[PDB]
Chains A and B, each alone.
Chain A
């Protein structure tokens, strides 16, 4: 996270860290959506141009962490969106990971909500701010504490004009414009972590996005791109209904 701040204790209890098992290395962010299911970006697990293809036995997750009470969980299975497009633009950059055992909820471990249509329509508007959290680099180093930054959703024509990559309906972009004075972005290591928004209608936090990709970090005129979680919710429900516990 660039231009963020240290998270308060329990501020993001759905935060999950995705690690390579051996050799141990922090790979990505992720999020807890139930006591058995973790959401992340597909490109954290599968990216053929870099010969990346992690499956469940390659991985572990750390849940409830704040500093570098926390639970290490093994993975039973991972599920990558079957129409994930790594060749062109990371379309459908989403994956589910099933824990081998249910994680116990606590003050530090608690799941985030997935949006329904009314919540998505209400909150996913240009200028409305979401919250991004991660253990990624501070500039285009690693932090001692989970980092947090709030960023406004950007109008789609502005997102499109900012990159030569073809943008799909399964992405949105966020961040401050050059004339807005404030800064902030996700960066290397934040991929797969959540973009969350707090509903004024029921006081609940909803995961609207997944840190997916960007050009550099916090560049003037560039924006971070996020997987459109709501639009892919039917795939999420299909996986959980078919392979749930």
Chain B
């Protein structure tokens, strides 16, 4: 739906979960 993928308890509160940084690092780091 229009709001998909934005979690009420994280993205919508500008909070990150404990391991999502690991995903972002894999996308950026060589």
| Interface positions of A (Cβ within 8 A of B) | 5, 8-11, 13, 33-35, 105-108, 110-114, 123, 127-131, 148, 150, 152, 197-200, 203-206
Contacts and interface: CB of A to CB of B under 8 A. Distances in A.
B9 A107 contact: yes
Contacts of A148: 19
A200 B25 CA distance: 11
- The 8 A-B residue pairs whose C-beta atoms are closest, nearest first, are A204-B5, A10-B9, A113-B5, A113-B4, A129-B26, A205-B5, A107-B8, A111-B4
Contacts of B3: 105, 110-111
Given A123-B27, A152-B26, A198-B23, A204 B9 contact: no
A11 B23 CA distance: 14
Nearest to B19: A150
Interface residues of B, number: 19
Nearest to A11: B17
A111 B22 contact: no
A197 B8 contact: no
Contact of A111 (B1, B10, B17, B27): B1
B8 A11 contact: no
A128 B8 contact: no
Given A8-B17, A34-B1, A200 B7 contact: no
A130 B10 CA distance: 17
A10 B22 contact: no
B4 A204 contact: yes
A10 B1 CA distance: 18
A110 B13 CA distance: 14
Contacts of A123: 27
Given A129-B26, A200-B24, A13 B8 contact: yes
A59 B14 CA distance: 37
Contact of B7 (A35, A127, A205): A205
21 contacts: A5-B19, A10-B9, A11-B9, A13-B7, A34-B1, A106-B8, A110-B6, A111-B1, A112-B4, A128-B23, A128-B27, A129-B22, A129-B23, A129-B26, A129-B27, A150-B22, A198-B20, A198-B23, A199-B5, A205-B4, A205-B5
A130 B8 CA distance: 20
Contact of A10 (B10, B23, B27): B10
A182 B7 CA distance: 28
